[PDB]
Structures are given as structure tokens and as C-alpha cells.
């Protein structure tokens, strides 16, 4: 219940502004267009079952930059009550072209969370009128790019009416359209086809704020509007970022907000879950079960270990929250503009930080000067999303993730000295330095997976062929050729073609790699059993058993073990495709490159018409002299220069990746003519396999087991601390 | 001297059309715009030192398709005299954006040739008024793409005046602008900066015909306008194709026309020469001397051998001539449209023949049904052109040549049975079949050069390292790694980047390959000298000496030997770059892929304005119901489909090329795990080098010597027949 404000509709005959409830002449309010329309009586019929905010919707045409809304004298309904309304929590939802099911899921999760907070009993912050402290800001990116089933859902809530959007106002290009309403209707069911909207006494009001950008700038500009724009006016305590389609759990927003009672917390995130469908029906898809296992282990092992140190690298799908005072200043300046100091040319970090979009913020929050903000991971809050079910869209999704992670980790390692310019105490500074070193160690390991997988596969298959001879010779040669053909084809198709065009090939390549992994598992088991009936296979069995047991125990400690059997084998079988198809495509597509009027003739009936023709000899001579003159007096734009720089930097990364991996391959296996060279050196005074292969094979597995052990200790510490 | 016709200027007061020499009201002549403007008196001053064609210039706006000009009632000045003028020779010049120096060179060569023909004494065809039998048709491609220094040269000749070009006439888009004049001024000198134009009693008139297309369609459309368009009206005996910048020799057009006195000749071409500059100054550039040698040998060996059989594959720069009756019908239909029979989908040959643009015509002229046309090569006629002097533009030029040659040869081999459906006698049919088989043999050899060069280099360097041990071990390993790095980088940069962006790398790669070739030459000489002080190096010395001697003798027989010393070493040194840089880039770039208004606000002084607003409750309810309705009722265009097909077919060619070359590499050198496989097979019961390397090394050189011998016999037969 309860609202009020003073509207700006239009002027009548007396000239004193009049309300509809109580060709026309208007008046710009302070120089910019603000209009107040009533809503249809169909909504009023539910609403009655009445103050000013429920019955009007306010359109504003924002013609300025995000960082100038207040100066230009633009406002929001929250500031214009008799007592200005103070917001505790601003929830940002970003759409690009998402359909109404995804947006419906996000809004329904938000509405359920707000209802939970409003029904809270013993709280100083939340209570019966807690909905007044929450603003839901839906920033859609382009009118041309929005779906009409989303604008139809937004309209059905009461927060959109067409007709009074304007392209320009006093020769000023309108940059954005803002629709403001407070709705009493809630979403109660979202089937595969329909969204159930209903309004009764049990519903809670939601202060929606629909922003519609005029043209599609990317997501960083949406965040620019959210943080530099409306957050400056509303002054929220916490700013929460959600994507359309990410449905928060029933208490996730409250449980994340509860994380900020520690005054040192500057940001927080929760768990992101794969949405397995109805009765886990989607778990039959190997691509979906693999992703389910990957998400569960990224949350259980990686996030807890990072949160112990104090710096988290929030996962792309999960919804995050930042304390607004934490990000004001340097972090937002780095996030939106980049390293401002820059000459006409291009620098590596400054021109490439857009690849690591949100992971910059986190870094700058932790290493902020004279401030001891920490990032913290909340396991009590979760959000479930749908994952790609087809190989091409899976590849296209992970292209962004892998490039962002690689660049963010390189940037954080290269600039770690900032940890010591911040305001943390000495112990936290040491912990953060150790964590950044460990994260770069992980990045370095992930950079050499191309060689690691091939070396493990080739050593294993050749060793079994050497030892037992039966049909493993032919199998070794055949699998070498299959690997080579698939890898060459993946390189060529990712450098030149698009994944949508060739889907059968990518599916076939994934199947080939799965069969390869099955063969490697068989070889390992066979060699181990024969040895039990040498030392290297003792090491392989002990190390792999240990790394499986640590995963299982960490899942049990986290109290979420069911993914360790329903989804493990699928992930194991698709791991070679993660190494060999996702990484190649991600590295081959780093930057997403993209390389007078004369007159008219209209004739009359007779075929006649009139013309302006050079008739005087003098003007013909003039034109002739002007062309006789041209025969006597005898880098392009910034966009293509930036495109050239991006292409150079994308192609220098692939070459270095391939060469540095083949260096290790050639050192271990003595490829590259090295075995020839040693042979001919001795002749101056080739073997099948050396002891370098044994040493490397052991080292790889020990690294895997060590990483599992470190992450197990991290997760154990996380759970123990949280439980105490 | 001597012209006349009836002009179409405009209507005066009496209404009977009036001439300027003897806002106005006009009249479409037969429904289309034809205007006749006078020329400036500056030209008249030279001209006097007078009939109708010299003093007027005729603009026509062509709004129809090339194949419809006569039906739509468009004409040319040649048909409209009292006695219609019959053309013997139509010279087509195509520009895209060439500057005035290139066009000036072409026009000056043409003018000098016409002057030679007009001064001819004992000829039935040519005489004092021979200029009346020649029409020079300059087809420029796009108004936006033409240079202004070219339109200033064309205007200075009298064949262009601006002002009366029209975009549309009676709602018909004007497709092309035709300017017609007969000029008495000639070009007498073209320095680096100025073009010397002069008019006196020694000058010869030229019937120019400047076509200016409205928008840039590519060159095949220009030929479509020339052949299906103006050639249908003029009815020439011979149609000659020239590019802007190609300067014909002083008698080249007459000597090519002389080839057509044999009634069986359907086409002909002459020699194309590299323009070495002033006093051969450009011969200092290695890239230019290499091209000079390449052109001289392509003319001496390839063209004569082809001309003996009866089918030539005219070189891209050379100017060619077709007997018009020969190309009418099937050849032009295949050249312009492709295989007309085609479903909605894409077929290989039909959708890729545009890559082999002019080489289609030649094929269809020889294999025309019931006709015994032959193609013949004329050594008495030549044209000199400028060649690229920088590596990126050289690469970009050869991209087109290599793809065209490869596709044309594949097409000619696959469809050779048509030779037997033509009208030739049995012996010529056998000769043509043999020639097509030989040409496909050459194509097949050129497809495996990637493996041939590497195998020769690796066998040679490893053999010298094995035999003498001193520092050839290190050199072998170092050169293997240099080759690998350069090849991988070339693949990655040609698949992903543009040659303009990375010029230093391409120059460095060419230098690296030149040093590699120097090392290989040294190794061959060293091994041969040591053997003389085994049998394989006897074969190498005999075979390479024989293939050099045959080249030298063929150059002497042709009476053009000077390129065998001034330009030979440069070509030898750049040959690895031809194999390894031009071919990779050509194959990696086969197809040149390229992947509501709202309202406005203007306010008065008071800030007030008027609007159309939905005021009635009924219309707001209507809009709400129309959005509540959308929530209840719950492949792209041809261009991108063709782009996807082109990408698929371009990337399937690279993969097959690489795999089929590596198959040969792995068979000969036992790479690919094959030596491992044989070793472990024997263990079930690796060497440095095998005898396969010896056999392959001999075979490659014998093939080279055999090709030299065949081409020597061909050139000898050509010269002997011509001399008899
Ligand atoms: C060094 C590489 C530098 C690394 C740079 C970049 C890393 C690239 C990794 C390639 C792995 C090569 C492994 C290797 O040792 O090469 C082997 C094969 O010799 C070759 O065929 C070399 C081909 C060059 C590959 C360049 C990649 C370009 C992709 C398109 C490729 C187009 C296909 C090119 C061929 C038509 C070496 O042969 P060998 O040792 O002399 O034979 C002795 C065998 N024996 C002892 C049993 C008798
Ligand atoms: C078969 C190929 C199928 C052809 C398909 C396509 C043709 C490609 C030509 C490559 C030439 C390979 C030559 C070869 O035999 O491979 C050798 C190296 O083993 C490898 O490293 C294989 C790497 C795959 C190359 C695929 C090209 C992709 C370019 C990007 C590449 C990314 C870099 C990938 C590595 C990080 C084989 O090793 P080996 O014989 O087991 O060692 C024994 C040596 N010994 C006897 C002296 C002890």
C-alpha cells in the first residue's frame, strides 16, 4: 500500500496542469521530456481487490550520457515523494534479445525473493514495507534488438506503453527511454509456453524501472548506465547484477545480502547451478551432464579455495552483488574506460581489458588503495540457469569465458604489486600474493594442456604397443592419424569458418575424442593389471585413485555428492573435447574481428520536359579548363586501424601457443629432428622411447594429484570456518 | 576527315529541333534520353588546323540490361550515318580505378597502332580511312570508383562533359552512361607525371566510346556489356580485350589481327613483357627480375608448346583477341551465366567457374560443337606491363592467378570428352586430348610442390649431415625449425590476417627461404664435388645441368636469351617463396569471403508544443490487449547461404591439400609414426634414412628434366613451323 507524487501530463485550457483521473498543449519540464500516462482499467480491477504510483507510468527521454543524468536535471520516481524513498538494494537485469521465458524466470525469482523479505518478521531492515527499499532495473539493449514477447510481458506488468517514444528532442538524439511503474501483479508460474500473472492480496508490489537503449552497445555500456547512471541518483547500498534467464533461488538475494553485514565485504557471489529440467530429464544429454559436473566442481573446489584467500573471480552465469561504496571511484573507472593514460597508439593491457569484462572490477575492489575490501563467496545463495545443449552454441559460449579467464589471470599476475599498495593488514596481503601466484600457476598449467594431452595419449598408447604387441601397434598408428586429422581440421575451421556451418564435423570430432579417451582408460587399466600380476603404472594408479577420492570426499564435505555418479563419466568422456576443441576455437577467435547525386527525369505526356543545361559556350569552356587543370597539379580511419591491431594481436597469440606447446612435445618425445641430431652426433664420434617420457608422465599425474589436494584442503577450511 | 549525323539536342520556339552551331524544352527520342552537346572552342582551334562527329559529343543514358540495348531502341553513332559504318576491330579497355598514367599508356599504344594501320600502303583492309573501321570502347566500372585524373584525361580528349548524367529516367534506374566522340588529338608522350596531348596534320582520328557503369560490378559484367551489348550493335569482326595499364607494342594489334587470316582461328594472344623501367633500372629489384624471368619462360616454353596443340590458356596480363562469330552462342553463355541448369542448391563447377574467368571462353571456343576453331599464339605481337614491386601486392595479385589456373585446369580435365563432340578432324581431336592430359599432369605436379620442396630440402641437408658430420647436423636442425616456424606462421597469417598488415614478416620469410635455397645449392655442389673426387649425385648434376642447358637453348632458339643471365639467379632465389608463400595464401583465400521511426520534438519559446497522444481510455486498453495477445499465440537470405557454401568449399580444399602432401612426406621419410610401427612390428617377431628417399630424390629430378625436354621440343617445333 501507499504511494504519491506530482505528475507531468500536459496543460489544458486554464493552463494549470490537470490530471486525467481527476492534440494537446505540453511543456518540457526543466528542458527535457517527462510524460505521465494512466494505465488501463483492467489493471485497476485487480488493484482495487489508491495512491499515485500504481495508476501512472512515467516515460522519460534521456538524451545525455550516463554520467550526466543529474546535471541535465533527469530524476526517478524514488526521489520525488514527500519523503524521498531510500533504496537498500538495486537489482540490475540486462537483456539483449532474450525471449519472454528467460526474462519471466528472472523476474519471478526476484519477485519471490522480495516477497520472502517482505514477510520477514524479526529484522531491523526488512518488514511489511520492505518492497520500498528495492528497485528492479531492467536494462534492455536496443529497440531493434528487443524481442516483442519480452515487451509484451513488460507491458502486461504495467511498465510499458508504446506511442510516446521519441528519436530526438530539440535536435538532441534521445539515447534511452525510461519507463517507471510500481506493479502489484506477480508471476506465479512459468510453463514451457505460458507465464502466469496474477494479482491478489498475497502479491507484493515491485518498483520496476525499464530502461530501453536506442542502439545496441554491448553489456559494459549497460553496466555503465546502471552504475554511473541510475545508481548515482538512487544511491543504493548494494548493487546486484543478474542476467536474463538466471533464476535466483527462493532465498538467494536475502542470503547474499546477509553477506554484507561484515563491513569489510566489498563484493559477493553465490552458487550457479545447471538447470537439469523436469525430473532431471536433460541429464540424458552428455553435453549437459558434463556441464553439470563442471559447474559443481567449479563451485565446490575453486570458489571455496579462492574465498579463503579473499579474492574471487565470479563465474559468468552466477549473479553477483557489489557494495556500492566499494566500487565507486577507481574500480568503475577501470571497468568502464580502461587505463585512461594512453597515447594515439594501442597498448596490450589497456586495449585488451575489455576481454575480461567483470573480472576487472573484482581485482580493483581487492587492491583498492587505503581500503581493505574483500570478496566473499556465499554457498547459501544459488541461481539456476539453462546451459547450451548443442555443440556449436556451447563452443560459442565458451569462447568468451576462456578468453576472459586467460586475460584476467595474466593481468592479475602482472599487476600483483598493487596488493601491497592497498590498505589490508600484512597477513591478508601475504595471503593475496600467494593466491595470485597460485592462480597464475593454474593459468600456466592450462596453457600447456594442448601438449599435455597429446604427450599422455602418445606415451600411453606407444608403451602398450611396445609391451604387448598384439594389435596395439595398428591402434597406435590409427589413433595418431585420427588425432592429427581432427586437430588440423579444427584449426582450419576455427580460423576460417563458423561453427554453425559445420555441426556434423564438430559432433564427429567430439565422438572421436571420446573413443580416444575410452582407449586410453583401457590402456591404463590393462597395464596396471598386468603390472600387479612397472613403477610408472604404480604411480598412475595411486595418483588417479587419490585424485578421484579427493573429489568424492570434497563433494561429501560440501554435502552435494550426487553429481559424482550421475554426471562423472560424461565429463570424463568429454574432457578431451574441452582441451582440444574449446581451447583451439577460443584462441583462434580472440577478438571477433570484422574487417554526388546527379538528377532525375520525369516527362510529360508529349515526352517533353525541362532541364538546366550548360548552354553558353563560356561554361563549357570553363568545365573543359577545370578538367584540363587536374592534369597539371599532379592511413584510413581509426576503426580499421584498431581492427588491424586486433588481428595482429590475435594471430600472434596462436603462433606462440602452438610453438610453445610443440617445444615441450619435441623435448619429451625427441620430435623435431632432435633424435636424428643426437644419432648423427654419436655417428660423428633412433630409439623408440626414452626416460624423459617416464619422467614427464609421472610429473603430469603428480601435478594433477597435488592440485586436487590443494583444492580439497581449501574446501575443507571453507566448510569448517563457515560451520564454526 | 569526314563525318556526319543528325543530332538530338532540344526544341526551341518554333518546335523544330535546332543546332547550337547553326531552361529549354526537350523530348525523349524513342523513350530514352539522348543528348548532343558541343565541344569547347579550344578543341576547334586545333581541329581546324568541319563535319558533325568531331564537333559534338553524344550522351546516352542506358537503363536496360546489356542483352537488350537494341530492343529498347538504344544505338551508337556508327549506325546513324548516311552509309552505316562497318567496324573491323573493336578494342575493349576495362578500368576499375586505374590512374591517368596507366590509361594514358594503353590509349597511346592503341593510337600508335591505329596510326600504323592508317599509314599502311598495300592492304585491302587498311588504308587512309582505316580509322573508320576501329572503335575504342573504354568501359569504366562505377562512377564512385573512377579516379578524377582518368575522367580529366578522358575529358581532355573530348569524350566526357559532366552535368547531364542522370540517376533515373521515368522511374527507371539508369544503369550506364555512354559518351561518344571522335577525337583528332593524340597522345605523344607519357612521362612519370605529365601526358602530352597534341593535334596536328599528323594525328589520326579515334572513335572513342566511353562507358561509365553506375555501380561497381566486377570485370565479367564489363565483358558482358562489351560482348552482349555494344558488340551486338557494332557487329565487329574481331573483339580485342585490353586492361588499363597494358601498353601494346607499336605493331601488336596489327600483328594479332594478321593471325585471323586463317579462317579456323577463333582466338589469339601475344607476348606479355615485364616493363623494366628506364634503362632497366627496375631490374635491381629481385622481385621484378624474378617476374621478368618467369614471364619470359612462360612465353617461350609454355605458350609455344600449347599453341602447337591448338589450345592456349592466355596469360592474365596479355591482351587477347576473339573472332566475334567464334564466341557467339555457347562460349559467351558459359562465360557470363555459368552452367544454366542448376537447382536451388550449389554445385561445384557451376558455382566455382567464376574463379577461372576468361579461361572458360578459350575452352568453349575449342570444344564448340560442329566448329573447328583453334586458338593460336602470336609471338610477333607483344604488350609491356608494370609488375608489383612489393611483397604484399605481389601476393594479392597472384592469389587470383593461382586459383584461376587450378580451377580452369581441373575443369578442362574433367570435361575433356567435349573435344570429341566438336567438329575437328580426328588428328586434331587426338592432339587436343593429349594436350589436356599433359596440362592436368602439370597441374597434379604443381599440387604436390609443398611436399616436393620439403622432401628435397630435408633429404639433401640430412644426407650431407650424415656423410660429413662437421656442422651440418646443427644446420639441418636449425633449418628444419626455421622452415617449420615460417610455414606455420604463413598458414596462420593467411587464414586470419591481411598481407598489408604484416609486410616485414613476409619480407623476412622470403629472405629466410632464399638463404635456405642458397644452403641447398651449396650442399648439392659440395656432395657432387666430393663424389667426383654417389650415383644419386651423378643423377642430380646431370639432370640439373640438362634442365639448365635446355632452358638456355630454348631461349636462344626464340632469339630472346638476355634474361638467362640478367634475371636467372633472382628467380632461383625466390622460387621457394613462390612454392611456400604464394601457394599457401592462394589456397587459404580461395573465395574472398565476407561474412520503426518514432517521432521528433521541436518546442516553442515557452517550451510548449503539440502532440498526438492516446488520450481515450479505450485506446490504452486496446494497446494493452494487443500486448496481452502476443503472450497467448505462442534460414536467412541467399547471400549468406552462398557465403557459407563458399567457406565450406574453401576450407575443404586446404585440408585435402595439406593431408595429401603430408601423406607423401610420411611415406617417403617414414614420419607419422610409420617408422615406429615397422620397428615395433619387427620387435613383435628406427633408421636415419631409407632407400625410398633415394628413389624419390631421383624421380623428382627426372620429372623436372623431362618437363624441360618436352617444352624444349614444343618451342623448337613452334619456331620451325613459323619459320617455314
Ligand atoms: C620442426 C617443426 C618446427 C615447429 C613449428 C611449428 C609447430 C608445428 C608442429 C608440427 C609437428 C612437426 C613434427 C616434426 O618433427 O616434423 C617431421 C615431419 O616434417 C614435416 O612435415 C614438417 C611440416 C611443418 C609443420 C608446420 C605446421 C604447418 C601446418 C600445415 C603443414 C603443411 C604440411 C607440410 C608438409 C607437406 C620432421 O620430419 P623428419 O624428422 O626430418 O623425418 C625423420 C623421421 N624418421 C626419423 C623416423 C626417419
Ligand atoms: C600423424 C599426423 C596426421 C596428419 C594430419 C595432418 C597433417 C599435419 C602435418 C603435421 C606433421 C606431423 C609429423 C608427425 O609425425 O608428428 C609427430 C609429432 O606429433 C605431433 O606433435 C602431432 C601434432 C599434430 C599436427 C596437426 C597440425 C595442426 C597444426 C597445429 C599443431 C598444434 C601442436 C600440437 C602438439 C602440441 C609424431 O610424433 P611421434 O612419432 O609419436 O614421436 C616419435 C619420434 N621418435 C620416433 C624420434 C621418438
Author numbering:
A (entry chain A), B (entry chain B): 245 to 266, 375 to 401, 409 to 892, 908 to 969, 977 to 1015, 1025 to 1075, 1087 to 1125
Task: Copy out sentences from the published article reporting this entry, exactly as the authors wrote them.
Using AlphaFold2 predicted structure as initial model, we built the atomic model of Chs1 in apo state into the cryo-EM map at 2.6 Å resolution. Except for the N-terminal region and a few short loops, Chs1 is mostly ordered and well resolved. Except a short loop ranging from 245 to 271 residues, the first 374 residues of Chs1 are largely disordered and invisible in our cryo-EM maps. SDS-PAGE gel of purified Chs1-ΔSL showed the N-terminal region has been largely degradated during purification as processed by trypsin, indicating the N-terminal inhibitory region of Chs1-ΔSL is more sensitive to proteolysis. This finding is consistent with our cryo-EM map of Chs1 in apo state, which showed the segment 989-992 of swapping loop packs on segments 245-271 and 376-379 of NTR. Interestingly, we found that two phospholipid molecules fully filled this cavity and were sealed inside by EL3s. Clearly, lipids play a structural role in stabilizing the structure of the Chs1 dimer. In the apo state, the path from the active site to the chitin transmembrane channel is blocked by the VLPGA loop, in which the proline ring of P675 is stabilized by packing with the indole ring of W760. Among them, L819 of TMH1, M886 of TMH3, F911, I914, L918 of TMH4, and F1098 of TMH6 form a closed hydrophobic gate, blocking the cavity from connecting to the exoplasmic side. In the apo state of Chs1, the putative active site is open for donor binding, whereas the putative chitin transporting channel is sealed by a switch loop in cytosolic side and TMH4 in exoplasmic side.
